[PDB]
């Protein structure tokens, strides 16, 4: 049916997470930082993506 | 005092209270001290006592990693 | 003798704009973005610096 509400926003964010970094073409990236401040794996057994420190520093020792 | 394997494991251990951002090291840490990387000659966890003891040393990090998600706080400033 | 909450904040947030950036450091710009969206100049013709989306633009001629 549809891309979604809900990734409307996370690839807007992405895009302007393109603007904060400098970058005139949408990373995977950036749609990784959007994506995973929307969604929220909270089981005991977590599996919620590791906050931002450790996703952005990883995100920047990239290649 | 200690030599530089037994500092090792120490200073990782205390690094992973720090990693987990607790106030304080717990024995929980000093396990995860015990199995940080697979680096064969790591008597703590792979060339091990656990193997030899017939005894799964990578259960025992999900053990390990079982427990370390339950410390109850990651607050950075209130961390070491 | 204290930063308070005031620039505890205010730093706390500059550290998620390094998120934001990709930024393995807190940048001086990340300060003032923060500083920029808690504070303002109390006067009786009282002033606030343009949202900081319009300030990361001219951040980035800068380097």
Same mark, same amino acid.
Request: hydrophobic share 40%; charged share 20%; no cysteine.
């Given at each position: 049916?549809?891309? =979604?509400y809900?990734?409307?926003k996370?690839?807007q964010d992405?895009a302007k ?7 005139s073409?949408? $990373? ?5 930082f959007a994506?995973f401040?929307? =969604? =929220?794996?909270?089981?005991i057994?977590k599996e919620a993506q590791?906050?931002?420190? $450790? ?9 | 005092q200690?030599?530089?394997? $037994?500092?090792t494991i120490?200073t990782?251990a205390?690094?992973?209270? =720090?990693?987990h ?7 929980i840490?000093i ?5 940080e990387?697979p680096?064969?000659?790591?008597v703590?966890?792979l ?8 005894y ?5 990090k999900?053990v390990?990693?079982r427990?370390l998600v339950?410390?109850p ?5 209130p961390a070491?």
């Amino acid at each position: 049916i549809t891309p =979604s509400y809900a990734l409307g926003k996370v690839l807007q964010d992405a895009a302007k997470i393109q603007k904060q970094q400098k970058d005139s073409f949408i $990373a995977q990236d950036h749609i990784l930082f959007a994506l995973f401040n929307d =969604s =929220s794996i909270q089981q005991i057994f977590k599996e919620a993506q590791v906050d931002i420190e $450790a996703i952005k520093q990883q995100a920047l020792e990239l290649r | 005092q200690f030599t530089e394997r $037994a500092l090792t494991i120490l200073t990782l251990a205390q690094k992973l209270a =720090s990693d987990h951002q607790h106030p304080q090291l717990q024995p929980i840490h000093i396990l995860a001290a015990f199995i940080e990387t697979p680096e064969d000659g790591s008597v703590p966890y792979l060339q091990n006592l656990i193997e030899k003891g017939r005894y799964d040393y990578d259960l025992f990090k999900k053990v390990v990693n079982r427990n370390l998600v339950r410390i109850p706080q990651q607050q950075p400033a209130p961390a070491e």
